[PDB]
Design a protein around this motif. Structure first.
Motif, PDB file in Angstrom:
ATOM      1  N   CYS A  44       0.787  -1.631   0.207  1.00 49.00           N
ATOM      2  CA  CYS A  44      -0.421  -0.179   0.560  1.00 49.00           C
ATOM      3  C   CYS A  44       0.566   1.057   0.020  1.00 49.00           C
ATOM      4  O   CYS A  44       1.834   1.087   0.744  1.00 49.00           O
ATOM      5  CB  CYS A  44      -0.711   0.141   0.999  1.00 49.00           C
ATOM      6  SG  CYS A  44      -1.896   1.779   2.137  1.00 49.00           S
ATOM      7  N   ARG A  45       0.740   2.045  -0.985  1.00 48.17           N
ATOM      8  CA  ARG A  45       1.901   3.369  -0.958  1.00 48.17           C
ATOM      9  C   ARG A  45       1.355   4.700  -0.315  1.00 48.17           C
ATOM     10  O   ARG A  45       0.158   5.089  -0.398  1.00 48.17           O
ATOM     11  CB  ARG A  45       2.411   3.418  -3.172  1.00 48.17           C
ATOM     12  CG  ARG A  45       1.906   2.765  -3.708  1.00 48.17           C
ATOM     13  CD  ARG A  45       3.416   2.608  -4.654  1.00 48.17           C
ATOM     14  NE  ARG A  45       2.138   4.211  -5.406  1.00 48.17           N
ATOM     15  CZ  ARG A  45       3.358   4.781  -6.776  1.00 48.17           C
ATOM     16  NH1 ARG A  45       4.141   4.523  -6.581  1.00 48.17           N
ATOM     17  NH2 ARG A  45       2.389   5.515  -7.421  1.00 48.17           N
ATOM     18  N   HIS A  46       1.891   5.110   0.165  1.00 45.89           N
ATOM     19  CA  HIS A  46       1.988   6.423   1.361  1.00 45.89           C
ATOM     20  C   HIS A  46       3.019   7.797   1.309  1.00 45.89           C
ATOM     21  O   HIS A  46       3.824   6.679   0.041  1.00 45.89           O
ATOM     22  CB  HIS A  46       1.506   6.040   2.436  1.00 45.89           C
ATOM     23  CG  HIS A  46       2.474   6.338   3.325  1.00 45.89           C
ATOM     24  ND1 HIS A  46       4.113   4.140   3.280  1.00 45.89           N
ATOM     25  CD2 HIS A  46       3.037   6.237   3.910  1.00 45.89           C
ATOM     26  CE1 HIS A  46       5.077   4.438   4.054  1.00 45.89           C
ATOM     27  NE2 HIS A  46       4.081   5.588   4.582  1.00 45.89           N
ATOM     28  N   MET A  50      -4.339  -5.792   3.567  1.00 48.47           N
ATOM     29  CA  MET A  50      -5.144  -5.869   2.040  1.00 48.47           C
ATOM     30  C   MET A  50      -5.257  -3.403   1.464  1.00 48.47           C
ATOM     31  O   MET A  50      -4.630  -2.894   1.099  1.00 48.47           O
ATOM     32  CB  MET A  50      -6.735  -5.966   1.666  1.00 48.47           C
ATOM     33  N   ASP A  51      -6.271  -3.130   2.689  1.00 48.37           N
ATOM     34  CA  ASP A  51      -6.405  -1.593   3.227  1.00 48.37           C
ATOM     35  C   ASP A  51      -5.921  -1.117   5.102  1.00 48.37           C
ATOM     36  O   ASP A  51      -5.649  -1.619   5.882  1.00 48.37           O
ATOM     37  CB  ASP A  51      -7.386  -1.816   3.445  1.00 48.37           C
ATOM     38  CG  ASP A  51      -8.615  -1.382   2.192  1.00 48.37           C
ATOM     39  OD1 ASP A  51      -7.929  -2.483   0.820  1.00 48.37           O
ATOM     40  OD2 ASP A  51      -9.775  -0.586   2.034  1.00 48.37           O
ATOM     41  N   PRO A  52      -6.490   0.139   4.528  1.00 44.97           N
ATOM     42  CA  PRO A  52      -4.594   0.701   5.745  1.00 44.97           C
ATOM     43  C   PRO A  52      -5.550   1.180   6.874  1.00 44.97           C
ATOM     44  O   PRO A  52      -7.165   1.571   6.310  1.00 44.97           O
ATOM     45  CB  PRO A  52      -4.316   2.180   5.438  1.00 44.97           C
ATOM     46  CG  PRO A  52      -4.899   2.548   3.789  1.00 44.97           C
ATOM     47  CD  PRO A  52      -5.476   1.445   3.393  1.00 44.97           C
ATOM     48  N   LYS A  53      -5.692   0.423   7.816  1.00 44.94           N
ATOM     49  CA  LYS A  53      -6.532   0.982   8.854  1.00 44.94           C
ATOM     50  C   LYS A  53      -5.466   2.213   9.886  1.00 44.94           C
ATOM     51  O   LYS A  53      -3.895   2.901   9.921  1.00 44.94           O
ATOM     52  CB  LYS A  53      -6.552  -0.117  10.457  1.00 44.94           C
ATOM     53  CG  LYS A  53      -5.619  -0.876  10.766  1.00 44.94           C
ATOM     54  CD  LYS A  53      -6.271  -1.550  12.122  1.00 44.94           C
ATOM     55  CE  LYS A  53      -5.066  -2.484  12.244  1.00 44.94           C
ATOM     56  NZ  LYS A  53      -4.603  -3.700  11.420  1.00 44.94           N
ATOM     57  N   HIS A  54      -6.309   3.305  10.930  1.00 45.21           N
ATOM     58  CA  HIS A  54      -5.958   4.309  11.388  1.00 45.21           C
ATOM     59  C   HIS A  54      -6.630   4.563  13.428  1.00 45.21           C
ATOM     60  O   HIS A  54      -7.311   3.943  13.021  1.00 45.21           O
ATOM     61  CB  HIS A  54      -5.485   5.735  11.006  1.00 45.21           C
ATOM     62  CG  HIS A  54      -7.604   5.745  10.363  1.00 45.21           C
ATOM     63  ND1 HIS A  54      -8.338   6.382  10.879  1.00 45.21           N
ATOM     64  CD2 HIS A  54      -8.305   5.016   9.559  1.00 45.21           C
ATOM     65  CE1 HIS A  54      -9.648   6.659  11.101  1.00 45.21           C
ATOM     66  NE2 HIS A  54      -9.389   6.354   9.256  1.00 45.21           N
TER      67      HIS A  54
END
Lengths: 111, 110
Positions: A88-90, B1-5
């Motif tokens: 995941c790119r950031h 898969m998806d980012p969390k915060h």
């Protein structure tokens, strides 16, 4: 064998022109590090992309981070953290312009 | 898969009778977690002893940690961290009696 200790806010250069990274713990498949920003942002066009997961938190100062596919960068104040899965790119949209921004970052297996 | 915060200062149960642990990330041989203390200490004669290394920091509040052999507890304030190698015995001598103590802990392989 013996325990090590430190303080994340000690020996922090104020105004260093570039970001500073300092590892706190290194083990197979694992790195814990302190990052010291002084107002820098990711350069134009630049995106991080790692085969490891990253967990990162602002401990002092402030920032904005954008994850690809998000509509905008996210505000991050002290205590805000972000998990960035492998690939995941950031990017860092900004860091505090008035004081150092100290981060705690953990790099580990996507496994 | 998806980012969390999240935010380590969100949903802090002040005055909870017991210490609260909540994982932020879990991977093979790795756990990052938030710990909330509200004045609790390790009971008399208790020592932790883990096959994993632990890296732990006080983000808010204060505490004393005593590693086996220590002549006094190590006083930890915000920003203070400590790496406890696998099988190094330790305990929490005290946590702040006036406010919550918010910790960030990382457990990983030796």
């Amino acid at each position: 064998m013996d325990p090590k200790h430190g303080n994340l806010f000690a020996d922090v250069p104020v105004g260093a022109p570039d970001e500073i990274f300092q590892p706190l713990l290194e083990r197979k498949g694992l790195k814990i590090e302190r990052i010291i920003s002084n107002g820098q942002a990711s350069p134009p066009g630049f995106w991080y992309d790692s085969p490891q997961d990253e967990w990162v938190m602002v401990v002092s100062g402030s920032a904005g981070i954008e994850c690809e596919g998000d509509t905008a960068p996210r505000v991050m104040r002290p205590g805000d953290w972000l998990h960035v899965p492998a690939h995941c790119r950031h990017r860092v949209a900004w860091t505090d312009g008035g004081e150092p921004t100290v981060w705690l970052a953990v790099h580990c297996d996507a496994a």
